[PDB]
Amino acid sequence: GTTCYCGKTIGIYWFGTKTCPSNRGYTGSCGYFLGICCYPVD
């Protein structure tokens, strides 16, 4: 697992995708380097 940060809200980083997986309980997201950031962190 690898961290991400957006708007001073930390999250989990998802590689090789551009949307967040819906069943994982994410409340928000932002596009990130090589992929996407999904938050809160796991």
mmCIF file of N, CA, C and O in Angstrom, residues 18-31:
data_model
loop_
_atom_site.group_PDB
_atom_site.id
_atom_site.type_symbol
_atom_site.label_atom_id
_atom_site.label_comp_id
_atom_site.label_asym_id
_atom_site.label_seq_id
_atom_site.Cartn_x
_atom_site.Cartn_y
_atom_site.Cartn_z
ATOM 1 N N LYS A 18 -8.138 5.327 -13.121
ATOM 2 C CA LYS A 18 -8.535 6.749 -13.130
ATOM 3 C C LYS A 18 -9.843 7.043 -12.370
ATOM 4 O O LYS A 18 -10.233 8.196 -12.201
ATOM 5 N N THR A 19 -10.490 5.994 -11.875
ATOM 6 C CA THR A 19 -11.634 6.033 -10.942
ATOM 7 C C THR A 19 -11.359 5.208 -9.679
ATOM 8 O O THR A 19 -10.493 4.330 -9.681
ATOM 9 N N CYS A 20 -12.094 5.468 -8.597
ATOM 10 C CA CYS A 20 -11.963 4.737 -7.333
ATOM 11 C C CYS A 20 -12.952 3.555 -7.238
ATOM 12 O O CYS A 20 -14.134 3.729 -7.557
ATOM 13 N N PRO A 21 -12.512 2.367 -6.775
ATOM 14 C CA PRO A 21 -13.386 1.207 -6.567
ATOM 15 C C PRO A 21 -14.448 1.479 -5.490
ATOM 16 O O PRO A 21 -14.142 1.821 -4.346
ATOM 17 N N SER A 22 -15.716 1.305 -5.866
ATOM 18 C CA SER A 22 -16.892 1.731 -5.093
ATOM 19 C C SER A 22 -17.118 0.973 -3.779
ATOM 20 O O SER A 22 -17.607 1.552 -2.807
ATOM 21 N N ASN A 23 -16.745 -0.310 -3.720
ATOM 22 C CA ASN A 23 -16.976 -1.182 -2.556
ATOM 23 C C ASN A 23 -15.967 -0.967 -1.404
ATOM 24 O O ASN A 23 -16.118 -1.553 -0.329
ATOM 25 N N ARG A 24 -14.938 -0.135 -1.618
ATOM 26 C CA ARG A 24 -13.817 0.102 -0.685
ATOM 27 C C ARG A 24 -14.073 1.207 0.352
ATOM 28 O O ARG A 24 -13.275 1.371 1.275
ATOM 29 N N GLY A 25 -15.187 1.935 0.232
ATOM 30 C CA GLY A 25 -15.657 2.907 1.229
ATOM 31 C C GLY A 25 -15.054 4.312 1.104
ATOM 32 O O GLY A 25 -15.087 5.079 2.068
ATOM 33 N N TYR A 26 -14.504 4.665 -0.063
ATOM 34 C CA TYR A 26 -13.926 5.989 -0.314
ATOM 35 C C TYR A 26 -15.006 7.086 -0.353
ATOM 36 O O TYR A 26 -16.064 6.914 -0.964
ATOM 37 N N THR A 27 -14.731 8.222 0.295
ATOM 38 C CA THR A 27 -15.638 9.384 0.393
ATOM 39 C C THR A 27 -15.303 10.492 -0.620
ATOM 40 O O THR A 27 -16.125 11.373 -0.886
ATOM 41 N N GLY A 28 -14.119 10.426 -1.238
ATOM 42 C CA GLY A 28 -13.671 11.352 -2.280
ATOM 43 C C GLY A 28 -12.353 10.922 -2.927
ATOM 44 O O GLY A 28 -11.746 9.915 -2.544
ATOM 45 N N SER A 29 -11.945 11.659 -3.960
ATOM 46 C CA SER A 29 -10.794 11.320 -4.805
ATOM 47 C C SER A 29 -10.183 12.522 -5.535
ATOM 48 O O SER A 29 -10.792 13.594 -5.619
ATOM 49 N N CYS A 30 -8.975 12.343 -6.073
ATOM 50 C CA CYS A 30 -8.338 13.281 -7.001
ATOM 51 C C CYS A 30 -7.380 12.558 -7.961
ATOM 52 O O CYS A 30 -6.700 11.605 -7.572
ATOM 53 N N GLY A 31 -7.286 13.010 -9.215
ATOM 54 C CA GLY A 31 -6.307 12.472 -10.164
ATOM 55 C C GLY A 31 -4.871 12.720 -9.684
ATOM 56 O O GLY A 31 -4.557 13.810 -9.199
#
